Amino acid sequence: MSKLQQILTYLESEKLDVAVVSDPVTINYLTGFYSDPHERQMFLFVLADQEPLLFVPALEVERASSTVSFPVVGYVDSENPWQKIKHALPQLDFKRVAVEFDNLILTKYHGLKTVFETAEFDNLTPRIQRMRLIK
Amino acid sequence: SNAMSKLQQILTYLESEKLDVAVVSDPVTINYLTGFYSDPHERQMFLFVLADQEPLLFVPALEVERASSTVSFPVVGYVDSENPWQKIKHALPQLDFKRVAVEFDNLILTKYHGLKTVFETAEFDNLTPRIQRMRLIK
Amino acid sequence: MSKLQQILTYLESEKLDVAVVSDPVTINYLTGFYSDPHERQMFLFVLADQEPLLFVPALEVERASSTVSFPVVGYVDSENPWQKIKHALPQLDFKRVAVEFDNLILTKYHGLKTVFETAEFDNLTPRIQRMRLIK
Amino acid sequence: AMSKLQQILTYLESEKLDVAVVSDPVTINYLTGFYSDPHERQMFLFVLADQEPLLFVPALEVERASSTVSFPVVGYVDSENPWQKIKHALPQLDFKRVAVEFDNLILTKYHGLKTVFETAEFDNLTPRIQRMRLIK
């Protein structure tokens, strides 16, 4: 059972529509792709029903696509990343989203609130901390 | 964690050494990089880590099911009546392979001459020291 | 590692052919040369494999030349500055250029698109903001 | 105001050395302005007594080295034996006395160089370079 597969079972039990992973250390733990995007946006979206989506700066798309097997979407500096995420994700009613409270900065939290306009936000961090206990 | 994965470290290495692909032939190294272990005895098995797309694991037909549930990137198998070199060449992207790395401490001459039909005009560099370096981060 | 050197390292990591600095405050930060050109064109070009080029109005060439040690090119009002910049720079295939998104106005951006006709344009501002964190 | 490489030549004369072998990439870059980390591959700068130096590098570095320095660069690929290639690239002299950097040269490379200079005695080059760094 993949780590990503365990996230899926978690979404099913907590009635989450998506988990949004923002910390490059957690992204690498779950997918095997590591990058430090500095000021640019990068997120992994684990969605309840379909394949995940890794969203990265355009300069990382080829390396990320070679590293993972599910879809990767990039954005260049002149594109607006929040709109690009919103169009790349499935067009669902996202009522409940989990994010990493111990990593997510407020600039990103406000940006995700333009993607998920009426969601409540739960904390994903303790679930990933519990997952690391089992090697 | 903050440790670069082994596959991504080989991708990074392919770019800085200007390599088009690394060919891993040692079942021990393949298991180290992917967690898939098989002793193919006389049959062909290679992991091809390509510079710019996901890797290809190539195995005897009997290992395809176990290999495909172990790794998430493509697995191609071959049966005894198929010629493995032609099958690898058709399964790989049709690129111009100018530079290839292989494990000098493992690859026997019959496999080296087989890979020379797959990569007909490549130079061959040695991948072994890079993988020995990778094991120094434990 | 001088500031211009740090920009050089940055250009290699981000696969940029040149960084174009347009803000007089940033150019003074990087070089020690301060001028307000008003409506006239001034740019510092940091190139990946040679020394930088400071491009200024003709009246500033003397003071610029005696403030920095790399090449300074001037232009007078009757010269077209876009053409003169294009001739003064090396004759490379500029594929990727970085410019300061927070400073660069659209009339300058359009003229730089005449200098670099097929480049894609990345944002240099966050890199310079990161650099100022370290005294 | 003689160049660093010229100071090495004077040194080989006063010490009765046939050649100074520089193995530390930081020292090679100090003397020539060429920096490369070769990891496990061989790279040496050979400062010869009567003759221009020879920079020996992995094949991938030959182009960048060749445009950094103006004396001869020789590369080797992974399937060539670097010790045989060095020995054929150097002048066919009787190397009786050779200097190497005691503080950098690992035993694998010392044994390799002993195939190249089969009857030399080896002196320590490191203190001489440390003395050169004292002068701006």
PDB file of C-alpha atoms in Angstrom, chain B residues 17 99 104 123 125-126 129 133, chain D residues 39-41 59-60 77-79:
ATOM      1  CA  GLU B  17      26.919  14.312 -17.070  1.00  0.00           C
ATOM      2  CA  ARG B  99      25.765   8.822 -24.298  1.00  0.00           C
ATOM      3  CA  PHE B 104      31.346  -1.562 -15.573  1.00  0.00           C
ATOM      4  CA  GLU B 123      29.617   6.139 -26.100  1.00  0.00           C
ATOM      5  CA  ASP B 125      30.442   5.755 -19.548  1.00  0.00           C
ATOM      6  CA  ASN B 126      30.720   3.887 -16.217  1.00  0.00           C
ATOM      7  CA  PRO B 129      31.152   4.827  -9.017  1.00  0.00           C
ATOM      8  CA  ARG B 133      28.713   7.224  -3.932  1.00  0.00           C
TER       9      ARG B 133
ATOM     10  CA  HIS D  39      34.707  12.832  -8.151  1.00  0.00           C
ATOM     11  CA  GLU D  40      36.186   9.365  -8.738  1.00  0.00           C
ATOM     12  CA  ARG D  41      37.817  10.206 -12.117  1.00  0.00           C
ATOM     13  CA  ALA D  59      36.943  13.601 -21.478  1.00  0.00           C
ATOM     14  CA  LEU D  60      33.945  15.594 -20.489  1.00  0.00           C
ATOM     15  CA  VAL D  77      37.161   8.333 -21.483  1.00  0.00           C
ATOM     16  CA  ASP D  78      35.976   5.758 -18.911  1.00  0.00           C
ATOM     17  CA  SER D  79      36.972   2.779 -20.970  1.00  0.00           C
TER      18      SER D  79
END
